[PDB]
Amino acid sequence: STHYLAFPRASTITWGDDTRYWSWATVDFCSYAIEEARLLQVSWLDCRWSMDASDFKQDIWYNASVEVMLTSNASGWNVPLHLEIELPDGSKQESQIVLAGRQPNVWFKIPIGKFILRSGTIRFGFYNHEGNWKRGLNIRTLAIQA
Amino acid sequence: STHYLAFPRASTITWGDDTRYWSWATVDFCSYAIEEARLLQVSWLDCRWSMDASDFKQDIWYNASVEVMLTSNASGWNVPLHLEIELPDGSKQESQIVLAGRQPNVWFKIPIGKFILRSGTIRFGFYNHEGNWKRGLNIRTLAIQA
Amino acid sequence: STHYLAFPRASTITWGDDTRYWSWATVDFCSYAIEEARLLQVSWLDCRWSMDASDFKQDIWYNASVEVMLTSNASGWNVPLHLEIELPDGSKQESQIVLAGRQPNVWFKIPIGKFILRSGTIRFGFYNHEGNWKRGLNIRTLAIQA
Amino acid sequence: STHYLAFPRASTITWGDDTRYWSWATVDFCSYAIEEARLLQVSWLDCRWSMDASDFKQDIWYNASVEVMLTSNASGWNVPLHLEIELPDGSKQESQIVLAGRQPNVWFKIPIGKFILRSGTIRFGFYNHEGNWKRGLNIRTLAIQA
Amino acid sequence: STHYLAFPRASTITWGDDTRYWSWATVDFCSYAIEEARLLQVSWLDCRWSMDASDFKQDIWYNASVEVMLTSNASGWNVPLHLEIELPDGSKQESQIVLAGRQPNVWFKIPIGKFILRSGTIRFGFYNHEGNWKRGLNIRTLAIQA
Amino acid sequence: STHYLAFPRASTITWGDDTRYWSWATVDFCSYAIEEARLLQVSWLDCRWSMDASDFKQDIWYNASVEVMLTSNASGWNVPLHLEIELPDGSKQESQIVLAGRQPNVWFKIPIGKFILRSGTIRFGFYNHEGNWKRGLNIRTLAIQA
Amino acid sequence: STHYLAFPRASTITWGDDTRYWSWATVDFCSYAIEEARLLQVSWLDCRWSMDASDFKQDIWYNASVEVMLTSNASGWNVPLHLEIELPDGSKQESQIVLAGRQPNVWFKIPIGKFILRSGTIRFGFYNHEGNWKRGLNIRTLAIQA
Amino acid sequence: STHYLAFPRASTITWGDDTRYWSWATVDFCSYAIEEARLLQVSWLDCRWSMDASDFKQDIWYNASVEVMLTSNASGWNVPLHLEIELPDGSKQESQIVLAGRQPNVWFKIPIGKFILRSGTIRFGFYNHEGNWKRGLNIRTLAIQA
Amino acid sequence: STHYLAFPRASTITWGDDTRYWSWATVDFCSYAIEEARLLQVSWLDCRWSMDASDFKQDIWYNASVEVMLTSNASGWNVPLHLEIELPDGSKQESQIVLAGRQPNVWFKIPIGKFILRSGTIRFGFYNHEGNWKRGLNIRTLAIQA
Amino acid sequence: STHYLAFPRASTITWGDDTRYWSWATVDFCSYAIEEARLLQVSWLDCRWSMDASDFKQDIWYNASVEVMLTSNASGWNVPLHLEIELPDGSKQESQIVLAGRQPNVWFKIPIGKFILRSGTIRFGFYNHEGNWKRGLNIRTLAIQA
């Protein structure tokens, strides 16, 4: 069951405020006004939510997902999209996914890992820092469940 | 626009795990499994979410709401439901609302106050500690917006 | 806000007129002479007000309460006191309360349910038909509010 | 002894919802929240409670009163205030009273007549339909006694 | 260019003053205090502004719009919302729109027709008189332009 | 609360169409295209909106204002600007204001009087007919409130 | 006591398979997966279960009910919904009900008549063939009891 | 998804009406009154529902189950319980199950076979005709699904 | 005579893309669409145009100005606004101006210095880095003349 | 929106300084003194602005236009006017326009192409090098927009 939904405005997005690279659109989500982050083009693709471990219950397994959509204009996804949960000790749940040739214009949930706590910043995010242009990824929300 | 939804499982509820007083029900909320906290009866009514200030962006006004529903069986609401945001310094946004004779079986958003930052625990919650029995309040989510 | 107060004389009470089981006392209620129904002892405990739906406004949520007092001599309340609103179609808001170990000699409002109308008899009441003796309940009024 | 109190919200008041002519104010009446109907000015003065005969016990004489207050701003009462109980057969207990030069700011009970039953709508009310402006009548409650 | 903005208080709304069906909320509109008409529920949905033809210039084409918002609680809009301009000769610009499955929580301008004059009442409005319940339409203003 | 905004295009302005004396400029006003009337120079300064009394609700006090701006080039305002509401009976709410030495380049609302109805043309306007040149007054809108 | 429950998939529904007019939704009913028939809109409303008399015991009175729910979007029910049991000889138990202005979002059982046997098709159903659009009826099950 | 539930009263049970061998108990099943068939003891164990093929849709695969419970007093189940669907042509889907040493006091669904149609009696049932005593099987319902 | 006009979009503005501090508005400038940079509030006030020396003619004196407007809401200008032209060798034309108590709502041209060339980046700008809040400066254009 | 206006004095014009062929005239442009380049007659028609790529923002599409006017004395335009943007790599946006038989004495914007950057001279210009005499073209400004 879902503990937190966090919307991309609560995240840090490199070039997030620069309309050459990113855009925002107001939409309804089960009666709540949210803003989707809509990637036009960027090379330093980086989206991180920062939350404290004390926000979460200890001695219980959490899983985290990011809900996204590829547009008809999608390109540059022939590279590994790195998925990361950083715990307060400095350790990392590292995984990757390749978004190339997935169906456009449907929402899908990318799992970004699992964690358990036994106080301090937890980072949830995805990134690709390579010199190619990523285009046409829409971000809806980070979900944290237990 | 909505930055965080936090579901009652992420909160501390006095007698929350005791099926004499509280129950839980799995439902769908925009593709996501959540559990509604469904009050049968309690005298110490207390629900608190704990989040850290570093979860939030500075130099911007946040408002916080709690989405609830009264059942057909609702009673004991002829008392002030106290609403509280506690900031890290110990200071408090205190307000109250009276839920008696409201429409049952419709979701409504109780505003619990505003805050702005210029690091540390922020508490979002509602409570009534009086010796009467509160009955038939369903809790969906805490919403934090900016 | 309160639409109708109905005093126990306007109700049907099994054995109401039999001074072995029930008694009446004249008192003042806000400038108005009323008679409290004071249960000495009864096994068939049954109190019903009958009012017509056309007495009430449609497309609005009503709640109904019964104001009572337990005496120092109270006993037999370790049973479910059944609470009922019967609508004209035959359908029922069924709930219960247990009066055992409440404070004696203070007025309290028992909620007996909620209703909304979209013509015909509406019944408001409480009953316990078990073979034990209920003792020491004083009834002041049925309140109907919106 | 009092069988029913009915508050003006349960009644039909011509222009009742129109704040050019009528207003409402929340006050307490013996633990119960009621709304007083407070006439600012109206020419078609008409207040009617509708209750069914089956609400009442047969073979017993009922009397009905309306508790009102004139304000310091009272005027237009140099006309007959018509008092009426309409029985289900269509027949009417007609009387009148002149409110001019009465003490302001004290509650007084206007008797509006008597009835006995041996099923159907009973109307309790007062009216004046003349082209002058009635001002400064506050209505508390209809009382029905036996 | 805009000749008149007319706010819903200047209009006739069936059940407009009845808080079971309609509500009002004070908001700012470019320096000016206006009241939005916020439909909770009604079956006889009818909103008409009445203005005289002499208010308007002759031998010039006017267009008229009504600015509205659907809430997240919107329902009953799977029926034709009738749009009408009645000229003083009795003739009518009749059109309709279906509001079902539109984006909630965004203002949009419904065009209600065009007219040209070559003295007497002009009616601008929208209605649906069917026995279903319309819910969750907020009305900002009628605009008349030329 | 505001009932009608009327823009200067809906008014009669002596020499309004003559670009030696008056000019017009398209601007946005809360999403609505309006045209400001911008006085360059005129001696017969006269601006009148004509609306019918039946456009307005009876038994309620209306106030009317005209929102204007003086430019840096303002002059000839060392005379009384006459403010007038003409009612259908022929009677007039006459007031005046002196615009000399006010702050330029800020919008301010000139109150032009009050009226109540207990059918026919109502005129709202301002004028000065003296042989001097009035210069540099920009007109935004007539507001009618209740 | 209940002899058969028959779910709408076992019935014939005009336009049942056409998602412009009807939809289906999988839900749980006491451990059993059923599909509710959910009317969006249709003009030829017709739902018939066909069962043989030999399915049933002779010399005993059966009653049949259909359990339905009106949605918040309900409309077109200001017409008689015809209720019909056709026996093998061709004879019919004809009755009707009007669903307009009933509470939405609660299950209720429509009785569709009675039969007794002393071999061949029995039809249980409801229909309305008029040119208006029926909307927002959800069907759970036909119940046959004795 | 479930097409028909058929309760044991609709079936033929050898010695069903003889309280030495079988008993019945009224219980609630998702708001419907049903009677469980509760085997005390019998040697000729035989339960058959009879329905006509025309009750069912052709060219679609049906499966049938019987929901039962073994009591703490269960015995004699160390034999094959024969499961049978007889089609109208006379052909039979024959299978068996052994109920010995199953968990008592939990409902479980015995599959009794599959069928497809390309008019006439279909028999669904289970039997054991051996001379031993079967004891402590409770029958809830036959389910037919597609 | 004017050689180049450069509009604030062509410049770097600290917090320029952050709507907490800066905003943009589309306006017409002699038939050309430009965006005015409109300061709401900022502490690090910094605006720099970057152009290359090869953009300019050598052996001729250029002067540079910035056209701005203070709003009615202006504040924090009781500090020196630093004006700067940086030449490619690293040398700087430094001057300052105090904007406090200037006329609001009129465009004025701030001279930011002079330069002459005898290849490389030239920076034209104004800044104030002090910890107070600057508010209500609108920027139209940098002008370069010779 | 417009990023730069560049006036013909900032450009190189073959024979620009020779009053046999070209002339200059001081005029006002939105408060700014500019000089129009007014062609009397020339055979080598060539006008080039030189700006550096670092003057412009990367990863964004720019379009460039030249605003001109033909005089009543215009002639020699029965040839292709070549339009050119040269990028630093040496590559070219080549297009052409024919100015013969256009309206004289109105400003019009000739688009000269589009560019995007992913450091060095960018050339914007128009030319015709043929041996005929071009006459009566007035140049106002190069506009660069994004």
Ligand SMILES: CC(=O)N[C@@H]1[C@@H](O)[C@H](O[C@@H]2O[C@H](CO)[C@@H](O[C@@H]3O[C@H](CO)[C@@H](O)[C@H](O)[C@H]3NC(C)=O)[C@H](O)[C@H]2NC(C)=O)[C@@H](CO)O[C@H]1O
């Ligand atoms: C050269 C190549 O392979 N392709 C180019 C892209 O690399 C380039 O993207 C930009 O790359 C720079 C350099 O990595 C990014 O900035 C760096 O990354 C982070 C920003 O948070 C920071 O830690 C580094 O200091 C910073 N180094 C710099 C400024 O060089 C920059 O974010 C990328 N820009 C964008 C818009 O994504 C793109 C666009 O510049 O061009 C390709 O040709």
Ligand SMILES: CC(=O)N[C@@H]1[C@@H](O)[C@H](O[C@@H]2O[C@H](CO)[C@@H](O[C@@H]3O[C@H](CO)[C@@H](O)[C@H](O)[C@H]3NC(C)=O)[C@H](O)[C@H]2NC(C)=O)[C@@H](CO)O[C@H]1O
């Ligand atoms: C007697 C009466 O009228 N009311 C009874 C209620 O008081 C009682 O609810 C319990 O009340 C007690 C005292 O208010 C609660 O105790 C407190 O719990 C809080 C938070 O966990 C703790 O901080 C206090 O120190 C603690 N004080 C104690 C233990 O005395 C207790 O939580 C309430 N329990 C519930 C389930 O609401 C109920 C049931 O005990 O009966 C009423 O009749």
Ligand SMILES: CC(=O)N[C@@H]1[C@@H](O)[C@H](O[C@@H]2O[C@H](CO)[C@@H](O[C@@H]3O[C@H](CO)[C@@H](O)[C@H](O)[C@H]3NC(C)=O)[C@H](O)[C@H]2NC(C)=O)[C@@H](CO)O[C@H]1O
């Ligand atoms: C049996 C026992 O241990 N306790 C006795 C009580 O049962 C008994 O109360 C009386 O109970 C009967 C039946 O429960 C009540 O009679 C019923 O009355 C209602 C209408 O009032 C009618 O619908 C029923 O048919 C009728 N059933 C009968 C007569 O069998 C009766 O009201 C109860 N009386 C009182 C005063 O409550 C008490 C009192 O006699 O004695 C206990 O020992």
Ligand SMILES: CC(=O)N[C@@H]1[C@@H](O)[C@H](O[C@@H]2O[C@H](CO)[C@@H](O[C@@H]3O[C@H](CO)[C@@H](O)[C@H](O)[C@H]3NC(C)=O)[C@H](O)[C@H]2NC(C)=O)[C@@H](CO)O[C@H]1O
């Ligand atoms: C002119 C004068 O001396 N007095 C005016 C009043 O007559 C007038 O009061 C309004 O009078 C009309 C007519 O009596 C009322 O309309 C009546 O309303 C009733 C109830 O709904 C309805 O049954 C009648 O058919 C209807 N008569 C009609 C339609 O003519 C109206 O209710 C009165 N208004 C109020 C607010 O009481 C007032 C207001 O117009 O002005 C006096 O000057």
Ligand SMILES: CC(=O)N[C@@H]1[C@@H](O)[C@H](O[C@@H]2O[C@H](CO)[C@@H](O[C@@H]3O[C@H](CO)[C@@H](O)[C@H](O)[C@H]3NC(C)=O)[C@H](O)[C@H]2NC(C)=O)[C@@H](CO)O[C@H]1O
């Ligand atoms: C003479 C002086 O000092 N100032 C002159 C201004 O008076 C004059 O303005 C014009 O004045 C005339 C007379 O007041 C205006 O004409 C009047 O207009 C109204 C209708 O608008 C009409 O009912 C009157 O009959 C008419 N008066 C006449 C013609 O007798 C006229 O509108 C004014 N014009 C303007 C542009 O405001 C100006 C301009 O003529 O000149 C000054 O010298």
Ligand SMILES: CC(=O)N[C@@H]1[C@@H](O)[C@H](O[C@@H]2O[C@H](CO)[C@@H](O[C@@H]3O[C@H](CO)[C@@H](O)[C@H](O)[C@H]3NC(C)=O)[C@H](O)[C@H]2NC(C)=O)[C@@H](CO)O[C@H]1O
């Ligand atoms: C125009 C108007 O007022 N109402 C229209 C509706 O009538 C129409 O519903 C369709 O109506 C037709 C005619 O009644 C229905 O077809 C009929 O019904 C059965 C089919 O089971 C058949 O036995 C009849 O002969 C057949 N008559 C024909 C085909 O003419 C049809 O089922 C209705 N459609 C639906 C989806 O309910 C609707 C939609 O067509 O439009 C209204 O405007």
Ligand SMILES: CC(=O)N[C@@H]1[C@@H](O)[C@H](O[C@@H]2O[C@H](CO)[C@@H](O[C@@H]3O[C@H](CO)[C@@H](O)[C@H](O)[C@H]3NC(C)=O)[C@H](O)[C@H]2NC(C)=O)[C@@H](CO)O[C@H]1O
């Ligand atoms: C029965 C059904 O299908 N739905 C019910 C609705 O009919 C009903 O709303 C009320 O409906 C009537 C008629 O549509 C409306 O009465 C009319 O009011 C108008 C405007 O005042 C007037 O012109 C008509 O003369 C009058 N018709 C009558 C009285 O016969 C009435 O305004 C509606 N009320 C509301 C609140 O919208 C609603 C509520 O009763 O219930 C539905 O079930």
Ligand SMILES: CC(=O)N[C@@H]1[C@@H](O)[C@H](O[C@@H]2O[C@H](CO)[C@@H](O[C@@H]3O[C@H](CO)[C@@H](O)[C@H](O)[C@H]3NC(C)=O)[C@H](O)[C@H]2NC(C)=O)[C@@H](CO)O[C@H]1O
């Ligand atoms: C003797 C032994 O070992 N066991 C005894 C059981 O046989 C007996 O149960 C009864 O068995 C008979 C024969 O199996 C059953 O009669 C049969 O009933 C069917 C269906 O009606 C019918 O087709 C047969 O003709 C009939 N067979 C006959 C008459 O021979 C009978 O239904 C069984 N009864 C019960 C209650 O299950 C029991 C009880 O007599 O005793 C065992 O000792």
Ligand SMILES: CC(=O)N[C@@H]1[C@@H](O)[C@H](O[C@@H]2O[C@H](CO)[C@@H](O[C@@H]3O[C@H](CO)[C@@H](O)[C@H](O)[C@H]3NC(C)=O)[C@H](O)[C@H]2NC(C)=O)[C@@H](CO)O[C@H]1O
């Ligand atoms: C403390 C006080 O009275 N004033 C506060 C403002 O100073 C503060 O504005 C921010 O101030 C900081 C400190 O100078 C600025 O940070 C600097 O920004 C420049 C430009 O990017 C950067 O080069 C410096 O490294 C950086 N120093 C840091 C971060 O340590 C910052 O830009 C200012 N922000 C704004 C919006 O102007 C405001 C809120 O930011 O709070 C005042 O109370």
Ligand SMILES: CC(=O)N[C@@H]1[C@@H](O)[C@H](O[C@@H]2O[C@H](CO)[C@@H](O[C@@H]3O[C@H](CO)[C@@H](O)[C@H](O)[C@H]3NC(C)=O)[C@H](O)[C@H]2NC(C)=O)[C@@H](CO)O[C@H]1O
């Ligand atoms: C001869 C004819 O039919 N018409 C004559 C025009 O051709 C002539 O204009 C001059 O033309 C020459 C050649 O087109 C131009 O010279 C060129 O200038 C460019 C750059 O300015 C340079 O790259 C070339 O090297 C150079 N070519 C040479 C020198 O051969 C010259 O610019 C033109 N002059 C003008 C004023 O446009 C005119 C004027 O002499 O006379 C026509 O009759």
